[PDB]
């Protein structure tokens, strides 16, 4: 069901891992504010004063799964089950997925999202992620409240920050 008796299993109906084949994207994280700059023959420079950046970390939306990790070209192992929140981290002006524990609420995954995104849904009560160069991957029993993170992170990241949504509704 959706709530009380729900479902992550079976990893077997899931879809497999692939290796990351796309080339390992930038995080605009690191530079917050500042792109790269060419030289004297090819000479980009964006510039661009983005006026005061940051306030707090503004969490987006927030649903309950599991997150698989790829070992290298084709296993999904269980890192960690959970709740998984999209935060909005203003002050380094970047996105930050983190994945949360349930039975600890530890926290102990985060992935720092691309400035260039795209989210990949094989949709079946799965969804898939891009890293650095490996895959990750997020596993519920709830497409719904999937689809609203999945597309919010995806969606605002192509908007620019134009929303500051805490929760999804």
Same mark, same amino acid.
């Given at each position: 069901?959706?709530?009380?008796?729900?479902?992550?299993?079976?990893?077997?109906?899931?879809?497999?891992?692939?290796?990351?084949?796309?080339?390992?994207?930038?995080?605009?994280?690191? +530079?917050?504010?500042?792109?790269?700059?060419?030289?004297?023959?090819? #000479?980009?420079?964006?510039?661009? +004063?983005?006026?005061?950046?940051?306030?707090?970390?503004?969490?987006?939306?927030?649903?309950?799964?599991?997150?698989?990790?790829? &070992? =290298?070209?084709?296993?999904?192992?269980?890192?960690?089950?959970?709740?998984?929140?999209?935060?909005? &981290?203003?002050?380094?002006?970047?996105?930050? +997925? #983190?994945?949360? &524990?349930?039975? &600890?609420?530890?926290?102990?995954?985060?992935?720092?999202?691309?400035?260039?995104?795209?989210?990949?849904?094989? #949709?079946?009560?799965?969804?898939?992620?891009?890293?650095?160069?490996?895959?990750?991957?997020?596993?519920?029993?709830?497409?719904?409240?999937?689809?609203?993170?999945?597309?919010?992170?995806?969606? +605002?990241?192509?908007?620019?920050? #134009?929303?500051?949504?805490? =929760?999804?509704?």
């Amino acid at each position: 069901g959706s709530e009380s008796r729900f479902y992550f299993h079976p990893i077997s109906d899931l879809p497999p891992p692939e290796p990351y084949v796309q080339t390992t994207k930038s995080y605009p994280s690191k +530079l917050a504010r500042n792109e790269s700059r060419g030289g004297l023959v090819p #000479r980009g420079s964006g510039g661009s +004063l983005f006026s005061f950046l940051g306030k707090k970390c503004v969490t987006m939306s927030s649903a309950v799964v599991q997150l698989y990790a790829a &070992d =290298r070209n084709c296993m999904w192992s269980k890192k960690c089950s959970g709740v998984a929140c999209l935060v909005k &981290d203003n002050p380094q002006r970047s996105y930050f +997925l #983190r994945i949360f &524990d349930i039975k &600890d609420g530890k926290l102990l995954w985060e992935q720092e999202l691309y400035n260039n995104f795209v989210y990949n849904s094989p #949709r079946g009560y799965f969804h898939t992620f891009a890293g650095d160069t490996c895959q990750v991957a997020l596993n519920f029993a709830n497409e719904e409240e999937a689809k609203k993170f999945r597309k919010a992170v995806t969606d +605002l990241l192509g908007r620019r920050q #134009r929303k500051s949504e805490k =929760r999804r509704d």
